[PDB]
Design a protein around this nucleic acid. Structure first.
Ligand SMILES: Nc1nc2c(ncn2[C@H]2C[C@H](O)[C@@H](COP(=O)(O)OP(=O)(O)CP(=O)(O)O)O2)c(=O)[nH]1
Ligand SMILES: [Cl-]
Ligand SMILES: [Cl-]
Ligand SMILES: [Cl-]
Ligand SMILES: [Cl-]
Ligand SMILES: [Mg+2]
Ligand SMILES: [Mg+2]
Ligand code: NA
Ligand code: NA
Ligand code: NA
Length: 326
DNA sequence: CCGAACAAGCATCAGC
DNA sequence: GCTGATGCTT
DNA sequence: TTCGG
């Protein structure tokens, strides 16, 4: 964290633009700037120095000069004073409350945590569970707990069907010492891009994890993506572990490598790689890499037999998961 | 100058 | 009900 | 807000 003050400032600006201004491109620009500065291996001495990095333009360069001179950004100082901005920023911290609902809640006088708790019947299901576990979902998961969670998930999936493969992705697969949640990629030979030979493949796994009281709540659930809540079991007389967000993604087995690339991330790494794919004439999603035709319409999926194959297509040298934490 | 900026699953809603 | 747009999320 | 053509 050579430049943690700068990257925190840019992250706070990004969140302001997303949550309050609902300006998604500004949000992305600030986040890209913070990510490129975060990996820059020198302590930044001037905006001009920072402007040399891709993603830092004139306006962010100027803010970095103000920050280095004074330790503060007046723009941010005033955003923190604004009650409506501060209200909206808080409400979006609840899972399921985004920029639109936060502002809508604002027009109704429902601001504080106390307000939300009094008006549970104004919340959809996702928002209600996000409020229920508001405190817990702000805590990080130590890697040691991620390992215990991995063991439960993999073993419970094995008990349903030994042919399932469950892989923990996200920051865990990138080797992080702590994670914000648990991301589980799931495959089964019956589900490929060619056929679905078994129904309920994701459901059966969700059900088993509920039976053993690992999964405790559901935020959303369809045939290939589960979003919910889990909790490690605690010993006698021990305080309970925090409840944790879990995401499970069932991916066609023949498309595992595109799937595990997507689900390992980071999010900014994915955006950067997909942007580069487009410049190289390809489009990458969690399923396939496809060439872009002369008019820019995706062609047919290219053959992929490793994560590295995807990097090769777009002429990037391979990056291990630990080096994708952008 | 100015168009593009990653891609998509699930929940919800409007309109038919 | 279906379709398509939108919100929220990964 | 930034970049690329
Ligand atoms: N193309 C894209 N892909 C994405 C995007 N958002 C998330 N993802 C992908 C990449 C993430 O690693 C993966 C998990 O998403 P998660 O939010 O859990 O991110 P972690 O890397 O695990 C940080 P942690 O706080 O959870 O520890 O989902 C996206 O906008 N666009
Ligand atoms: Cl914008
Ligand atoms: Cl500040
Ligand atoms: Cl693949
Ligand atoms: Cl596809
Ligand atoms: Mg995660
Ligand atoms: Mg571009
Ligand atoms: Na730059
Ligand atoms: Na939120
Ligand atoms: Na996640």
């Amino acid at each position: 964290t050579l430049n943690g003050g700068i990257t925190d400032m840019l992250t706070e600006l990004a969140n302001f633009e997303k949550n309050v201004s609902q300006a998604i491109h500004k949000y992305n620009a600030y986040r890209k700037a913070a990510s490129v500065i975060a990996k820059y291996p020198h302590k930044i001495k001037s905006g001009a120095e920072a402007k040399k990095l891709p993603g830092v333009g004139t306006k962010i360069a100027e803010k970095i000069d103000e920050f280095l001179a004074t330790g503060k950004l007046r723009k941010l100082e005033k955003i923190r004073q604004d009650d409506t901005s501060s209200s909206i920023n808080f409400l979006t911290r609840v899972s399921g409350i985004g920029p639109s609902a936060a502002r809508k809640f604002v027009d109704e006088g429902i601001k504080t945590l106390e307000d939300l708790r009094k008006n549970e019947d104004k919340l959809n299901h996702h928002q209600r569970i996000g409020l229920k576990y508001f405190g817990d979902f702000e805590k990080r998961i130590p890697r040691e707990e991620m390992l215990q969670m991995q063991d439960i998930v993999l073993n419970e999936v094995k008990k349903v069907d030994s042919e399932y493969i469950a892989t923990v992705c996200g920051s865990f697969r990138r080797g992080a010492e702590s994670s914000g949640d648990m991301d589980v990629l799931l495959t089964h030979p019956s589900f490929t891009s060619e056929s679905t030979k078994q129904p309920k493949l994701l459901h059966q796994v969700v059900e088993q994890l509920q039976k053993v009281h690992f999964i405790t709540d559901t935020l959303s659930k369809g045939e290939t993506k589960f979003m919910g809540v889990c909790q490690l079991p605690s010993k006698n007389d021990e305080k309970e572990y925090p409840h944790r967000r879990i995401d499970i993604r069932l991916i066609p087995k023949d498309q595992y490598y595109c799937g595990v690339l997507y689900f390992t991330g980071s999010d900014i790494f994915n955006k950067n790689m997909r942007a580069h794919a487009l410049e190289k004439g390809f489009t990458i999603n969690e399923y396939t890499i496809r060439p872009l035709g002369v008019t820019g319409v995706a062609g047919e999926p290219l053959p992929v037999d490793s994560e590295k194959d995807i990097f090769d297509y777009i002429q990037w040298k391979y990056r291990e998961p630990k080096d994708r934490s952008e």
